[PDB]
Amino acid sequence: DKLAEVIAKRILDYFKGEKNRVIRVLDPACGDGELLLAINKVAQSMNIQLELIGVDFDIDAINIANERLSRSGHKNFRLINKDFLEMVELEPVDIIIANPPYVRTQILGAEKAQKLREKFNLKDLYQAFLVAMTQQLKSNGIIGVITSNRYLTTKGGESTRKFLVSNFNILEIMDLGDSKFFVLPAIFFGEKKNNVPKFFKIYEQSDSVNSEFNSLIELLEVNKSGLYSVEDKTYSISLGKIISPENYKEPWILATEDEYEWFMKVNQNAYGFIEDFAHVKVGIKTTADSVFIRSDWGELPEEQIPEDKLLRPIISADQANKWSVSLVGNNKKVLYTHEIRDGQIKAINLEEFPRAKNYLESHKERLASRKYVLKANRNWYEIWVPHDPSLWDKPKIIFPDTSPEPKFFYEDKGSVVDGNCYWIIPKKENSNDILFLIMGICNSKFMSKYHDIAFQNKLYAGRRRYLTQYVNKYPIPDPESIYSKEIISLVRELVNNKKETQDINEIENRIEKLILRAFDIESLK
Incomplete structure (x- = not known):
């Protein structure tokens, strides 16, 4: 044949x-x-x-x-x-x-x-x-x-x-x-x-082997997975x-039948998805990071130290950690060039911040040499993509774009989010509590498994890509469920209370089992 x-x-x-x-x-x-x-x-x-x-x-x-x-x-x-x-x-x-x-x-x-x-x-x-x-x-x-x-x-x-x-x-x-x-x-x-x-x-496996079939061609029409032998060679069919x-x-x-069934069951037992409850947003792009993002602002000449209002804390992917990050002792701040003036997102007037003016003018050659900024009828000193100045003060989830393990954490110090991170704020009408539920889901082995099946498997490159297209489609259980309420309560504990690794793992174990109950699914693998 x-x-x-x-x-x-x-x-x-x-x-x-x-x-x-x-x-x-x-x-x-x-x-x-x-x-x-x-x-x-x-x-x-x-x-x-x-x-x-x-x-x-x-x-x-x-x-x-x-x-x-x-x-x-x-x-x-x-x-x-x-x-x-x-x-x-x-x-x-x-x-x-x-x-x-x-x-x-x-x-x-x-x-x-x-x-x-x-x-x-x-x-x-x-x-x-x-x-x-x-x-x-x-x-x-x-x-x-x-x-x-x-x-x-x-x-x-x-x-x-x-x-x-x-x-x-x-x-x-x-x-x-x-x-x-x-x-x-x-x-x-x-x-x-x-x-x-x-x-x-079908692949040769070297190291209940079904030896019923007599030819390699007959293996291509088998409707059941397993190991099959036709000679000295044994073939793995999936x-x-x-x-x-x-x-x-x-x-x-390939997704196995079990992975697909589990994937479908999570989808049908889902109450909704992250996009139904929250906005998943990207960080800023300054285009001149060495000018705008520094941790030595206090060591500049006094006439060049930007005014305090303009120096906002900024978080990058390398600082990412589960649940929360410690910002004390961290002086990484961005010179934020935009504000809400007359209900509109505008660039700051440099004449109102003479010290920031002195600093930025000392870098005017690099900043003004950005053709796309000047061609867009924007000021030479502007952060290229500053997003919305009023949204940084809201409590938010932050996560890195790429990570070998989920590092979703809560932030409520008004920090600006850098370009290698995304961040989550709730859609209006949802409480701040929904962020703790979303974070508990995002950081879980449950959702890591779901991510591997639905979007891309960590096994290929050793890391997961948390694209907004993926995170927006993370399933969320019923927030009013008693299990979702306990997840929220446990996550709030991990954020607000410094704990030892032994009981952090214990809380994380409880969240894993609670997610199973909230989705009415028995086990992962």
Whole structure:
């Protein structure tokens, strides 16, 4: 049994179109016709009539494909000796089964680079080939494409992931791994857009092994995960889901059935999400940090020490800690250049702060050399992104953008938040108590597990990215629940009371169990 037949069987089973008509199948790089012969053989087993269209450069491959297609008794086939990218008359097809050739990256001529940019609305020969296949496919058509599996996880595959999830309802991704079928191949099954996608994964495991199957090919149709042996080699097969592929900046990894079920249960038992209760905001960008953010303001010449009102405490990611941070002994302050004047966010008048004026004018060359500031009709001395001066005084949660563990802490000293941190304030009509609940959730192993499943797994890079797109979608339990009330009470204790590590861990243990009760979920793993 050929690998192409397992692809053919999956493609035809996924095809939701009418089965009593002629199905048009395109192989843009048919070669010797391995894929076209396979899909026709499976179609004959299901009494499906196919029109096989094969396109490939090099007559020698086309000639071999021509004699093999004719010998099968199938007469409704058509071979085009041409490059598919240069070719794109060919009507739209129902099915594309493909093994594209373009593997090595190369520089393209400027004439070919531009001709491919405009014709496929690009911003890579592999990208154009992928777009060329999609445009030739009918809406709700099925595609089965063999690629390397590198685009699933690497940053190089971001644009490939974006294109696929934008144009296709992903049906199934098969990660063939280290299995030596032919490179590390992956098979993509997609329905062209006019479904939680399945994820198949098979890898050789070296160190209840089911030895029932006699061939490696039969393993590709197993509907249950586990260890399987066909010879001296034992294979680990994982059937799962791919959750939120639209988040294409993160790798496309398999979620186990248990992880997906737990993920769905948390979502259905959730009372709401962080965005329903609070604003998740980003810190400031001064653009000249060495001028605006210092901890030696008192050591400047007296005529240059900015007036006290302008020096606000500023918190950066390196200071992040769970629950609370000690600001005593910390002199890191930002010269904050904005205020609320006449109900409007305006830059300060330097003439009102002569000492800050002396300091800033001593740095006027660097500050005025910021073209984007002057081009925006803004003053040379301004912090580029100062946000809202009136919001810093509110109690807030602060967390770093990247962290190997959750470091969400409460802050109520009117501190400004730097650019490598985000911060959370409640939407009006919600008490300040909601911040303690949110923090208890955010810092938990529960939400770390949820984050790994829903948005991106820490295991890939060893850190978690707390993007606002992720934190906004953190599930929150019923704040009026007796369990949420106890979480709030315990978190308020961790914030306001200096405690030893032994009972901080105890309180944190209580919060973990309370979150389970608040979501009505028994355990994590």
